[PDB]
Write a protein that binds this ligand. Structure first.
Ligand code: BCL
Ligand code: BCL
Ligand code: BCL
Ligand code: BCL
Ligand code: BCL
Ligand code: BCL
Ligand code: BCL
Ligand code: BCL
Ligand code: BCL
Ligand SMILES: CC(C)=CCC/C(C)=C/CC/C(C)=C/CC/C(C)=C/C=C/C=C(\C)CC/C=C(\C)CC/C=C(\C)CCC=C(C)C
Lengths: 57, 43, 57, 57, 43, 57, 43, 43, 57, 43, 57, 43, 57, 43, 57, 43
């Protein structure tokens, strides 16, 4: 019966917080972003040509 | 008395946004697969 | 006794949210997709002919 | 004293939801299946003969 | 007074959708297997 | 004081569910069994003689 | 008053389904093991 | 009676701050990327 | 003020369940034991002389 | 008033079953160590 | 309708605690920062030129 | 009726201390980076 | 204002349980000790010389 | 009104058992270290 | 309106417990410290020169 | 009405024991570091 309207983004992006409580999930969000950053660094740093560790002997 | 607690309107509204966002994510993923095949073909 | 009707998908897909509370599970869903992308990147990146790290010192 | 009747499967399979709340475990279930698929892909992909990464350079 | 809190009708409807989705997933997995066997046979 | 009777197994095996709520722990049990299968597969798969990946390119 | 909250009937009925399911899983695993021994013997 | 319990004004204010912080994070990340390409070009 | 009596073990071992509810922790206990068996097997299986994988192709 | 919430009877009787099952697990493990030493001695 | 005002940072940074309860999340924040330091140390220490382990038998 | 449940005074007090601690951690980290560059230069 | 007295250890060690509920944390404590033993075994076992697996061929 | 909720008697009784068990674990660990040094000396 | 005073450390360090409940977080703090020591040991132990395992068969 | 729920006296008493234990842990760690430098110097 009910027919939801088509949402317009990014204008209705704020509605995500109506669904997802920031008090519970904002920190998990930041931690996930950090985990991505760590994983990406791990794959790039593993390449010896893309890390600053250049001390010889 | 839904299991999740959501009303029908809530579930439908959330699903509508979910579907829209998923569609854009998929279009972008298809774009990225096309670009990566152009850059480095696979198979 | 009770015999449930055959669901029609994707027309009935919105019913998932009647079972799964998005307030609880939307962020875990996103993080799971993120974990998949990170694993997939790990396997493809690990292959030297499919990562952009082309600098040779 | 009580003697439970022998269940008939798959006819009584829906009773699992009477024990296991899907609102709380459906997403864990699907995440577990995904983990399995990642793990399987990880063992098969690691065989160079069973992945599409064929660019030679 | 079920352990999960679901009524019989809720459990039955959820099971019906779960079985349907599982069946599609299984068909698709079987397709995918046949297909990977065509691409690179195993055993 | 109180002296518990010696249990008879497997006839008293159902009493486990009086302690362990299946609604909470049945999915964790199944996931644990799955993890065991995945670890056993990982150790046996890793032996090239015991996996079906026989294609040689 | 049980620790888990289940009645005796619920615990017995759950155990009966669990045993049936475990038994089929065990039979299937035994078949898988003879099968894998036929394909690639061990020990 | 929102799912997350937030009011409209709370969600809007949080989103406004989240957007602002995300934009600065974005700008710093783009600057880090150019910068790392200056130091060691990729592709 | 209060000075507790010296416990006698294993006679008083049943008092542990007064402290730790089995309904919450029995499954965690079993899962930890399983993890331990898995790690032990990992280390012994890794030694080729102590696993049954003897097929040579 | 117990920390776990269990009564003395419940604790005793859980402990009696836990000991029973632990003893069988231990006997089985000892048999397994004996068999694995016969198959491949260690130390 | 409601139009939120553009926040001024770092002046409004304290508002984060109105959303994120420090009693719940301060410890996981610190543990996250510790994990980052462990991961960075792992990558830098792995380079023999950047760890103090200089003893040779 | 804040989301976290903190009053304005509590949030401000906690932030003041968090900032102070963060600043000291940062100065310590900067000193450590200077010392490690002295010991083993990078880049 | 209030100035706490210097505690005397180990006479005051029992007060830890007034802070830490053993109902909740005793099993995590024991699991942490188990993890430590596992990690230590993993490092010492990895040394063949400190390994009981002496079967060859 | 303790933080953990335990009474003084409960905390003391638990600590007494914990100390006794810890002492036995430590004695066994010391014996194990002595035996492992006899079997394979370290340092 | 409110303008918090500059805290004095370590004089106000006790206030952390007014934010962080020790009953919930003391054990996680202890576990984290243990994890750090295990990781540090892992990186130092891995270097054979800083390793007490000296037996050679 | 503290965030943690602890009173001022509880927080102070806990901090005093926390400090004391931390100090002993630190002195033991410093002794450990001195002994390990004697056994095998680093840097
Ligand atoms: C590996 C190849 C290159 C390199 C290339 C890149 C590139 C390219 C990028 C980084 C990025 C970063 N790298 Mg790197 N980097 C290298 C070597 C290092 C080394 C090292 C041991 O040598 C370290 C420690 C770092 C560390 C860092 C971080 C400072 C940063 C990722 C932040 C993050 O986790 O966001 C995810 C975590 C979170 C979002 C959680 C929240 C953390 C805080 C709250 C963020 C605050 C946001 C807000 C806008 C801040 C406002 C205040 C500001 C003062 C304005 N790099 C080498 C030299 N690095 C990224 C970056 O700069 O991002 C901005 C980035 O795009
Ligand atoms: C997802 C959950 C919510 C929601 C919540 C939020 C929140 C919360 C935020 C946004 C934000 C945004 N939202 Mg919204 N949003 C949703 C769904 C949508 C939909 C949609 C139809 O589904 C749309 C169109 C948008 C639109 C947008 C954007 C306007 C904006 C993010 C910009 C951005 O990051 O670009 C992506 C740009 C990049 C990824 C840059 C990548 C960096 C480069 C690529 C580094 C590589 C360098 C190297 C040289 C590259 C190689 C070269 C070759 C290309 C390979 N949202 C749903 C409803 N949205 C943010 C915003 O408004 O910010 C102002 C924000 O904070
Ligand atoms: C799963 C839990 C819920 C439910 C909740 C949702 C939600 C929530 C959403 C959907 C969405 C969809 N649902 Mg539903 N859905 C359920 C069960 C079903 C059933 C069913 C009979 O069981 C059906 C038919 C559908 C149908 C659909 C689709 C119409 C749609 C997803 C399209 C898609 O991603 O395709 C798959 C397409 C791809 C995988 C593309 C693959 C990318 C390629 C392969 C990349 C590789 C490139 C490389 C070159 C390939 C190599 C070449 C060779 C091929 C190897 N749902 C149950 C009831 N469903 C979404 C939707 O409506 O979006 C508009 C959505 O957001
Ligand atoms: C590695 C050496 C051999 C091999 C030897 C074996 C052996 C030996 C066994 C398996 C078993 C399994 N193998 Mg293997 N296997 C190999 C390669 C593979 C590959 C692959 C990528 O090549 C895959 C994907 C699999 C997959 C699997 C699963 C189908 C199964 C373990 C299930 C599980 O997780 O149970 C644990 C998880 C759970 C219990 C959770 C619940 C899962 C479901 C819900 C259980 C349903 C039970 C119910 C009674 C089913 C009723 C319906 C039936 C139709 C009757 N094998 C190679 C060829 N494999 C096992 C098996 O068949 O077990 C039955 C087994 O004993
Ligand atoms: C993120 C969640 C909250 C919030 C909560 C907090 C909290 C809580 C705090 C802050 C803090 C700060 N906030 Mg705020 N903050 C938010 C969003 C913002 C926004 C914004 C527009 O989004 C801004 C501008 C700021 C601004 C700031 C800064 C004034 C300050 C952090 C300084 C800092 O660490 O710099 C980053 C500086 C560095 C990373 C130095 C790095 C050192 C070098 C790089 C190490 C490598 C050395 C090696 C030689 C380098 C190689 C050479 C080449 C460069 C590669 N915040 C949101 C609203 N903010 C802190 C504060 O006030 O402290 C006093 C604080 O405690
Ligand atoms: C553990 C928690 C609960 C409890 C809950 C449950 C539940 C729940 C179930 C059982 C089940 C069973 N329980 Mg009970 N049970 C408990 C305590 C006990 C005690 C006891 C005295 O403590 C006993 C004797 C039993 C007895 C039993 C069995 C009758 C049955 C499991 C059969 C089985 O899997 O065998 C072991 C069989 C095998 C190990 C098969 C081995 C396959 C081989 C080894 C594969 C390798 C092949 C390869 C070639 C071998 C190589 C050669 C060399 C041998 C190496 N339970 C406690 C109280 N019990 C199940 C049941 O009733 O099913 C009908 C069931 O579902
Ligand atoms: C963090 C959360 C809380 C708080 C809660 C607590 C708690 C709880 C405690 C403290 C403790 C202390 N707090 Mg306080 N504290 C906070 C914020 C602060 C601030 C601030 C302005 O932010 C300050 C100045 C302090 C000050 C202090 C110190 C007096 C003390 C820790 C000493 C220490 O460990 O030194 C660091 C010393 C070392 C790390 C020694 C390292 C040894 C060497 C380096 C090992 C390597 C050897 C090898 C040879 C080295 C190589 C040579 C070269 C150097 C490389 N706190 C906030 C408010 N604080 C503790 C205390 O009072 O103890 C009595 C304590 O228990
Ligand atoms: C720990 C938490 C609780 C408590 C809860 C429980 C519970 C619950 C149980 C017990 C059980 C036991 N408890 Mg109690 N227990 C507590 C504290 C104590 C204390 C004490 C003073 O602290 C004591 C003395 C005991 C005593 C005992 C034992 C009688 C018994 C376990 C026997 C066992 O496993 O042996 C150890 C035997 C082995 C480890 C063998 C391992 C196998 C061999 C080593 C395999 C290797 C073979 C290879 C060839 C060896 C190489 C040769 C060289 C030697 C290297 N408990 C506290 C209060 N206790 C159990 C019981 O009564 O069981 C019937 C039981 O289920
Ligand atoms: C930590 C949280 C609580 C608390 C709760 C508890 C609890 C709970 C218990 C104790 C226990 C003890 N507590 Mg208290 N305790 C606290 C704070 C303190 C403080 C303090 C001033 O902070 C002190 C002095 C003590 C004192 C003590 C000891 C009397 C006792 C532990 C002895 C021990 O393990 O030695 C350490 C001995 C070893 C580490 C030996 C390790 C094995 C060896 C090293 C193996 C290697 C061999 C190899 C050859 C070595 C190589 C040679 C070279 C040396 C390298 N506690 C706080 C308040 N405490 C226990 C107790 O009373 O037991 C009777 C106990 O159960
Ligand atoms: C080599 C290798 C390791 C291969 C792995 C192969 C494997 C296993 C691959 C797995 C592939 C899978 C399996 C991927 C899953 C991808 C996925 C499944 C993506 C989903 C995306 C979803 C979205 C991006 C949607 C987000 C929707 C939002 C955020 C809606 C927010 C809603 C509102 C704001 C409405 C407000 C409502 C009110 C009532 C107020």
């Amino acid at each position: 019966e009910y027919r939801p309207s088509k949402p317009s983004n990014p204008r209705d992006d704020w509605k995500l917080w109506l669904v997802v409580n920031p008090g519970t999930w904002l920190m998990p969000i930041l931690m996930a972003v950090l985990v991505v950053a760590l994983v990406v660094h791990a794959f790039v740093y593993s390449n010896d040509n893309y890390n600053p560790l250049t001390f010889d002997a | 008395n839904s299991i999740s607690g959501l009303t029908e309107e809530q579930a439908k509204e959330f699903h509508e946004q979910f579907k829209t966002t998923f569609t854009v994510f998929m279009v972008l993923a298809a774009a990225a697969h096309f670009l990566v095949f152009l850059w480095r073909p696979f198979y």
